[PDB]
Each structure stands twice: as C-alpha cells, then as structure tokens.
Amino acid sequence: TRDQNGTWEMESNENFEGYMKALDIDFATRKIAVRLTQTKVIDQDGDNFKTKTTSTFHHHHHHRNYDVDFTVGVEFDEYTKSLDNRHVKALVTWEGDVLVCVQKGEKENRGWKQWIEGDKLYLELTCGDQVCRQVFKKK
C-alpha cells in the first residue's frame, strides 16, 4: 500500500550515527542524538504530502522538528536546519509502493526510501556509503 497517512511512533533506529557522520554532523551533536526517539505525522492526499517529524532526545531539554511538505514529481528546496544545515534540491517519486527521495547536491546516494508493511512504516536514510534503518508503528 502507498497510503502512509497517520501518526507513526519510532520503534527502532539503526546506524543513525553513521548517517549523521556521512553528513559531517559534529561529535557533540551526534552524542546528543544517542537513543533519541521520534514521532512522525503524515498527512497524505495522494501524491501531496505534509510531514512533521519530532525528535525527543534522551538528555536534552527541547525537541527538534523537521517538517517537510512535497508533491511527488515536483522538485523542491530543503534547508536541513536540524541536521547538516545544507541546501539540497529534493525530488520524491514512487518506485512501486516505495516512496523515494533523492536529495540532489554534493553528497552521493543522499536521500531516503519510505514504505508501509502491515501497520509499520519503514524509512531507510542514505548518504554516501551509509544506510540508517528506522521502523515506526502506527499509533
């Protein structure tokens, strides 16, 4: 299914460290991120998406919020203020039922793929030779 609507609560996050390192995020910031959790809210109307990803940290007094809206097939600008603070040109497409984002810029293989299995949302974030695998359950 391509229907990704819902509120999604993180159940696992593997190799977020390596993904952050591939984006050149500094040591202190990666350390703050250890064992964070997230809730991701997706409001999807066909190819039109509004998404809000809220990170809650283990030992930091505030959340971070990464909200991205897009239409499949329509390139858009991203300013990754809560990650590596770069400007990329993002394009989201479908590969079958997999939602695929390429973040065009200097880094090779930068983007993500997101798909549904049962009541779970899978997200694989990529940069360079690093893959971060996340799983969320529908709330």
Domains of the chain: 6-132 (2.40.128.20)
Per the entry, the structure determination technique was X-ray
Nearest to 121 by CA among 133, 109, 105, 137: 137
Distance CA 100, CA 15 (A): 19
3-class secondary-structure state, position 24: coil
- H helix runs in 3-137, sequence order: 16-22, 27-32
Q: What tokens appear for 37 in the block?
A: 């959790």
- Tokens 């819902």 belong to residue: 6
φ, ψ dihedrals at 64, nearest 5°: -120, 150
What's the residue count for the chain? Answer: 139
Residues that constitute the known binding site for all-trans-retinol: 40, 114
- For tokens 């039922």, the residue is 97
Bridge partners for 43 per DSSP: 50
Binding residues: 40, 114
Alpha carbon distance, N-terminus to C-terminus of the chain: 17
